[PDB]
């Protein structure tokens, strides 16, 4: 089972623009759909954007989102949630 | 733990091991290795001695400043025993003699004295007690030495039930009376190295499991006595009635008792250390 989602991105780098666009538009809808799923958004300067998923018993996977579009981010989350 | 005896440092000369040990019989063959190992790691060592202070001088460099404390004591004076063990957390009894004297017989050194030490140690609240017996202790031995070793082994357990009794085979080393004994002049022997015996004693202090147990410290291989004596003469490039009786007792096999392996010590082969002992005097097949 899924336990936690973390999204890392940079505040200014173009590589995180797609992730930035996703949080601007899709994040609120996402939070409403999954009210009890911690989706930790953590911005830090000059990091390549990443998606971390934590499953039961501390199993974790990470997916890169560098240069992704807002939809490619949406699909990446759709894959993780299901 | 009292704050003063919490271990500190890196296990060296200036460190604090947390061990406060009274070593009766420290001025002998086994005692000099035990004191050295205790001093190597910064233990407080109380050394009650019967001999002239001149004969304790080799022990002085073994500890940092203040870590070796010397005291006078008498085997038959219990007040002197109490003063020595009053502040210790472990008492190690290495008292013994390979012959009898006018003032002290085998019953004195192997029964009356060990019992007195164990009793005063218990009355003083000492937590740990290490007693050296002998592998071939038996109340049916032709040797009065080995008979007394058995009786004293029983009295120590009765007086100090939590005592750790160690039963080594004949010990060989630079200052032994085994390889040196043969180099100066049926039965199966399993001699054990002095450093292995010393390491096992040190490990019995640090090991809470060793409390209340009896150990048998023996070497790796068993040698027919004849083969052993021939080997010694080869490496060397070449007494009392009781001592002869002991030397001709076959080393008892006691598989029920724990050994050096249980205390994390690897028994040293005789062939590796034979030259070390016998070099100053200038391979036996084992029994599988």
């Amino acid at each position: 089972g899924l336990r936690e989602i973390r999204i890392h991105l940079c505040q200014r780098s173009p590589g995180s623009q797609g992730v930035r666009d996703f949080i601007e538009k899709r994040y609120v809808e996402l939070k409403k759909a999954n009210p009890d799923l911690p989706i930790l958004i953590r911005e830090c300067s000059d990091v390549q954007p990443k998606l971390w998923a934590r499953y039961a018993f501390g199993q974790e996977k990470n997916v890169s989102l560098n240069n992704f579009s807002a939809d490619q981010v949406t699909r990446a989350l759709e894959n993780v949630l299901s | 733990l009292h704050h003063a005896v919490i271990p500190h440092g890196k296990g060296g000369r200036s460190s604090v091991s947390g061990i406060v040990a009274t070593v009766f019989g420290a001025t002998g063959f086994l005692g000099r290795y035990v004191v050295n190992h205790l001093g190597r790691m910064g233990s407080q060592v109380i050394v009650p001695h019967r001999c002239e202070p001149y004969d304790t001088m080799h022990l002085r460099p073994m500890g940092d400043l203040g870590q070796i404390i010397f005291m006078d004591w008498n085997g038959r004076d219990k007040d002197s025993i109490r003063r020595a063990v009053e502040h210790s957390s472990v008492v190690i009894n290495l008292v013994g003699r390979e012959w009898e004297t006018q003032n002290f017989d085998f019953e004195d050194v192997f029964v009356k004295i060990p019992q007195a030490i164990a009793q005063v140690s218990k009355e003083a609240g000492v937590e740990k007690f290490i007693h050296i017996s002998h592998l071939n202790a038996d109340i049916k031995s032709s040797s009065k030495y080995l008979r007394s070793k058995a009786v004293g082994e029983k009295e120590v357990r009765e007086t100090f039930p939590e005592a750790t009794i160690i039963k080594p085979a004949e010990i060989f080393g630079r200052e032994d009376r085994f390889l040196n004994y043969f180099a100066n002049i049926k039965t199966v022997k399993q001699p054990v190295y002095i450093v292995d015996v010393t390491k096992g004693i040190i490990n019995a202090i640090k090991d809470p499991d060793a409390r209340g147990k009896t150990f048998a410290f023996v070497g790796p291989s068993r040698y027919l006595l004849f083969d052993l004596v021939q080997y010694v003469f080869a490496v060397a490039h070449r007494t009392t009635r009781d001592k002869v009786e002991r030397i001709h007792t076959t080393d008892k096999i006691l598989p029920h008792l724990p050994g050096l392996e249980d205390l994390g010590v690897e028994a040293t082969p005789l062939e590796l250390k034979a030259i070390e002992v016998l070099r100053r005097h200038r391979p036996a097949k084992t029994i599988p």
Partner: protein, 125 residues
């Protein structure tokens, strides 16, 4: 005649330092903070390199502070941050650099003590 060496400079194997005091130490590269008890700034000019603090214990005999750390008193001085970092790198020490803290320039005006309408007016001299 010269030769060509493209290796990164490393002298760990020819300094005689035990491995324990190369690989497990953490060097700190910094400009020491001004001692707040004094106004002088002359001790905040150079870069410093210290090592991680290790155990000290009380000597049983005297109560003196004993140590087993051979680097406990080692402090090195450097003109620039780059000099310090270069020295740490060739010696194989893992290091942390902290940026120099420079007092921010202030705006001072004795006249502001007597302001007609501002709170900077002092009530005592």
């Amino acid at each position: 005649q010269l030769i060509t060496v493209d290796e990164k400079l490393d002298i760990t194997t020819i300094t005689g330092v035990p491995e324990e005091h190369i690989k497990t130490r953490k060097a700190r590269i910094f400009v020491p903070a001004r001692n707040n008890m004094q106004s002088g700034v002359n001790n905040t000019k150079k870069w410093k390199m210290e090592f991680d603090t290790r155990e000290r214990w009380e000597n049983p005999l005297m109560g003196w502070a004993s140590t087993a750390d051979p680097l406990s008193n080692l402090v090195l001085t450097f003109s620039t941050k780059e000099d310090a970092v270069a020295f740490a790198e060739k010696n194989g020490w893992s290091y942390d650099v902290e940026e120099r803290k420079v007092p921010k320039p202030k705006s001072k005006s004795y006249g502001a003590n007597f302001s007609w309408n501002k709170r900077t007016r002092v009530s005592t001299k």
